[PDB]
Amino acid sequence: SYDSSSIKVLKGLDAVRKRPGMYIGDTDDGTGLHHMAFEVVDNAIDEALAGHCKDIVVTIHADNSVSVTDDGRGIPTGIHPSEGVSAAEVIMTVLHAGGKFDDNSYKVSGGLHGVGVSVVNALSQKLELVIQRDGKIHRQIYEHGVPQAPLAVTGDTDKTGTMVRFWPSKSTFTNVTEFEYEILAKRLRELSFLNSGVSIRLRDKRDGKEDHFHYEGGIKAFVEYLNKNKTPIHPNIFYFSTEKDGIGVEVALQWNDGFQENIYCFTNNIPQRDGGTHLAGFRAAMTRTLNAYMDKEGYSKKAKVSATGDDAREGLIAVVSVKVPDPKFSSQTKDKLVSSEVKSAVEQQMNELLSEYLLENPSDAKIVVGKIIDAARAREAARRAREMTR
Amino acid sequence: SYDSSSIKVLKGLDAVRKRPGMYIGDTDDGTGLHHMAFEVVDNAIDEALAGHCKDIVVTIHADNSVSVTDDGRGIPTGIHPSEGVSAAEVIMTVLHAGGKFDDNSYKVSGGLHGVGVSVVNALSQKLELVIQRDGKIHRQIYEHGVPQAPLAVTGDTDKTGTMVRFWPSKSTFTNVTEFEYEILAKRLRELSFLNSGVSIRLRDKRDGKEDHFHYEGGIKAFVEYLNKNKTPIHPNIFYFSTEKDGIGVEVALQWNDGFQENIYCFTNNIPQRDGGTHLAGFRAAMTRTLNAYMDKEGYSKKAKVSATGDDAREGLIAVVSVKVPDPKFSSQTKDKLVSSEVKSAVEQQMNELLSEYLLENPSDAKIVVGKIIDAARAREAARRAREMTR
Ligand SMILES: Nc1ncnc2c1ncn2[C@@H]1O[C@H](COP(=O)(O)OP(=O)(O)O)[C@@H](O)[C@H]1O
Ligand SMILES: Nc1ncnc2c1ncn2[C@@H]1O[C@H](COP(=O)(O)OP(=O)(O)O)[C@@H](O)[C@H]1O
Numbered sequence: 183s184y185d186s187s188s189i190k191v192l193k194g195l196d197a198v199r200k201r202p203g204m205y206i207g208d209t210d211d212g213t214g215l216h217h218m219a220f221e222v223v224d225n226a227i228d229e230a231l232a233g234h235c236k237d238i239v240v241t242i243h244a245d246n247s248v249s250v251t252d253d254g255r256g257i258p259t260g261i262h263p264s265e266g267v268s269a270a271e272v273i274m275t276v277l278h279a280g281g282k283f284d285d286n287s288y289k290v291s292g293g294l295h296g297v298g299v300s301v302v303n304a305l306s307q308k309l310e311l312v313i314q315r316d317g318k319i320h321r322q323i324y325e326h327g328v329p330q331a332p333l334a335v336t337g338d339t340d341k342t343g344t345m346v347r348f349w350p351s352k353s354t355f356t357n358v359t360e361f362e363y364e365i366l367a368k369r370l371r372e373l374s375f376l377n378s379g380v381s382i383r384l385r386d387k388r389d390g391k392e393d394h395f396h397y398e399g400g401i402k403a404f405v406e407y408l409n410k411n412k413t414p415i416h417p418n419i420f421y422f423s424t425e426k427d428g429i430g431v432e433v434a435l436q437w438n439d440g441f442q443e444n445i446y447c448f449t450n451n452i453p454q455r456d457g458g459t460h461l462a463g464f465r466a467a468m469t470r471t472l473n474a475y476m477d478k479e480g481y482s483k484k485a486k487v488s489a490t491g492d493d494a495r496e497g498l499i500a501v502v503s504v505k506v507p508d509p510k511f512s513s514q515t516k517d518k519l520v521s522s523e524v525k526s527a528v529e530q531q532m533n534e535l536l537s538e539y540l541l542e543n544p545s546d547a548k549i550v551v552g553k554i555i556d557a558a559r560a561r562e563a564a565r566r567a568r569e570m571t572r
Numbered sequence: 573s574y575d576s577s578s579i580k581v582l583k584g585l586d587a588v589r590k591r592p593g594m595y596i597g598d599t600d601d602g603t604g605l606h607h608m609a610f611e612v613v614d615n616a617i618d619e620a621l622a623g624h625c626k627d628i629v630v631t632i633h634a635d636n637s638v639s640v641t642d643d644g645r646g647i648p649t650g651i652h653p654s655e656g657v658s659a660a661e662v663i664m665t666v667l668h669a670g671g672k673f674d675d676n677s678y679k680v681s682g683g684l685h686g687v688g689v690s691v692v693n694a695l696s697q698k699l700e701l702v703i704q705r706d707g708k709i710h711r712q713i714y715e716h717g718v719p720q721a722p723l724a725v726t727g728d729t730d731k732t733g734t735m736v737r738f739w740p741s742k743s744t745f746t747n748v749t750e751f752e753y754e755i756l757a758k759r760l761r762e763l764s765f766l767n768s769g770v771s772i773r774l775r776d777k778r779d780g781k782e783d784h785f786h787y788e789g790g791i792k793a794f795v796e797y798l799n800k801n802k803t804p805i806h807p808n809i810f811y812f813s814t815e816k817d818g819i820g821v822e823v824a825l826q827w828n829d830g831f832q833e834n835i836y837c838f839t840n841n842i843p844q845r846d847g848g849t850h851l852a853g854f855r856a857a858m859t860r861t862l863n864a865y866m867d868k869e870g871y872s873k874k875a876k877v878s879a880t881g882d883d884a885r886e887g888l889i890a891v892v893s894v895k896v897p898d899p900k901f902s903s904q905t906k907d908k909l910v911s912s913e914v915k916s917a918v919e920q921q922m923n924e925l926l927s928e929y930l931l932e933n934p935s936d937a938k939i940v941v942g943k944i945i946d947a948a949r950a951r952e953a954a955r956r957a958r959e960m961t962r
């Protein structure tokens with residue numbers, strides 16, 4: 183009997199527990215598990231972006247919990263004017279609640295949805311919250327999303343910042359259930375390249391391992407690092423950082439002699455495994471710019487048409503980092519940027535500055551166009567050989 | 573000042589309006605716009621899977637609204653025991669509310685999240701709901717997710733079913749703002765193949781175009797259809813339908829003399845553009861079973877070629893439809909199936925039944941092994957041409 187009592191409402195965090203996938207991604211291959219840590223880390227990184235945080239510590243504890251400590255402003259502690267409990271508690275227990283729905287507290291931020299830490303709380307058997315703010319230490323404990331008592335002041339302090347420690351639910355995550363040092367490390371190293379002047383430490387209390395990331399060279403140094411165990415074919419890394427029409431676009435790239443294409447895209451420091459409109463603008467700009475270059479440098483009809491752009495990306499390492507008010511992602515996990523204004527921002531900036539670069543670095547230009555022509559001839563030899571077997 | 577008053581709670585459908593992307597996908601390239609219609613259609617299809625709907629009409633109106641009419645049970649109209657308004661209004665206005673969080677009302681369904689049609693409501697400047705249930709017609713109008721009056725009786729009727737008509741918000745959707753007949757057509761045609769006995773009509777009131785899909789041949793006929801403008805190389809389409817351990821696996825496939833690989837994956841009739849565990853099971857079983865056949869029958873030794881999976885899947889058309897209680901996906905839009913048990917389900921059924929198929933149809937088998945050898949030869953020739961060219 184299908185009727186009005188067959189309609190069930192999942193209230194609060196219950197929905198996240200029932201359908202974790204639409205919030206956190208894959209709960210079985212370990213990626214959603216680490217995404218839990220990434221949501222908390224992103225909150226700290228958003229405090230750094232805002233200029234308030236200079237120090238982040240990520241700890242893997244021996245009981246397989248993870249804590250994230252920052253010296254940012256501290257999650258607000260005051261009673262929320264509508265909910266009647268501390269804003270910290272609102273943040274932990276209510277989906278789509280946060281300070282990132284306007285641009286008053288964070289000019290630009292990666293959190294966006296207002297669900298990150300509440301999702302972490304929902305999917306944790308326990309969460310420990312310590313906030314240093316206004317000269318006070320506030321503490322609260324959650325067990326399966328439920329506060330054990332009101333947020334309480336337990337001591338004095340002269341510091342500001344937030345510590346969140348969480349113990350992931352045994353029920354929710356299957357297969358990969360233990361945090362992997364290296365996944366956390368890769369992410370925190372790239373965050374250090376993205377955020378000069380923020381100290382990011384990673385500590386593993388299970389085996390004593392630790393790391394301290396504080397790279398200064400920004401995404402140039404990032405491209406250099408990514409090319410470390412490869413062979414760059416040209417010495418001058420292309421780099422620029424611009425802000426136009428409210429959108430920041432930062433790009434660094436360099437070719438090696440390998441045949442792989444590695445383009446890392448970020449939006450407000452959030453990585454996009456599936457690319458999107460920044461990567462699309464990047465590709466369009468690269469293709470247009472290299473074709474213009476080969477035309478004005480008088481390459482043959484057939485050598486320029488030869489060059490596809492999929493040829494141009496062989497050997498390519500590139501980092502594309504955009505800063506956007508209100509980006510749009512096509513999922514909670516933000517794997518793909520779908521803000522269409524970003525495509526034209528990246529494409530325009532990159533067309534201009536990459537043109538310049540090719541003019542200003544003729545040696546790099548000749549080398550790279552050579553690589554591209556080689557890649558094209560390889561592709562063509564492969565095609566003809568394929569048709570020969572037919 | 574960053575404090576408790578900076579923390580905003582977005583209540584109900586307001587969250588979806590503020591952050592549509594995590595619910596509906598890409599609001600800029602037309603895909604999320606059309607997904608609006610697919611959410612509503614999928615609800616009707618769920619009534620069909622449960623056995624209560626034999627007739628669905630999708631209409632594109634001349635004012636760019638879309639309506640979906642089914643003859644299922646009708647969305648329940650009774651006052652919800654806890655929420656105190658009609659269940660229909662609960663369904664339209666509350667995220668994570670519905671009849672698919674247990675298996676009382678639908679044994680298998682694609683909706684899963686309890687958000688589909690309330691997301692459609694949220695992102696519609698207007699939505700018209702008409703329900704025919706228990707001898708009465710009930711109507712309600714919403715504007716940007718806000719009901720204009722409670723669900724009310726408007727008349728008498730002898731039919732049951734649900735009509736949802738929605739006018740997408742001009743603010744949410746950009747660039748592609750008009751419904752495309754063909755996108756809806758492709759999806760509905762495919763749904764007709766997947767759901768024998770369900771009449772599906774598509775009407776375009778902008779130009780009087782219409783279609784009536786009522787295919788009876790199931791996913792075999794689907795493969796036939798997908799291959800009709802191609803050149804199938806063997807006459808017997810491989811097909812099976814099984815259910816084991818609560819998991820339905822249905823597969824049809826046929827090779828053509830082309831070089832593209834087209835595998836369509838579905839979970840509870842929802843397509844997965846990004847594949848997932850069904851596709852992984854499929855791929856593994858295919859590769860293993862064809863290499864097994866090619867070794868025992870001696871083809872690998874005689875042609876001295878060492879075929880790979882990519883060789884196996886060149887020229888392949890396949891449909892993999894799984895039916896699972898509580899599938900897991902990695903986003904609201906359900907692009908990727910991440911239920912781990914499904915990989916094994918598909919892999920085992922494929923290994924068994926595909927083995928049997930190659931034995932019961934030796935002509936087909938010999939043709940297919942021939943294509944695979946050929947593809948392997950092209951691949952290796954291409955590899956050598958590329959390797960030399962450098
Ligand atoms: N480490 C932190 N330091 C300061 N404020 C924080 C921190 N973590 C969360 N917050 C506040 O909590 C809000 C809600 O966080 P969350 O639920 O993750 O959603 P979102 O980050 O998308 O707003 C944030 O927007 C920010 O206002
Ligand atoms: N056409 C329909 N006929 C009957 N019931 C429907 C129909 N559409 C929606 N419903 C009911 O409304 C509920 C909520 O739907 P929706 O918000 O789309 O989420 P979900 O489909 O995931 O349940 C469904 O679970 C079902 O009980």
Ligand SMILES: [Mg+2]
Nearest residue numbers: 225293298299
């Ligand atoms: Mg957050």
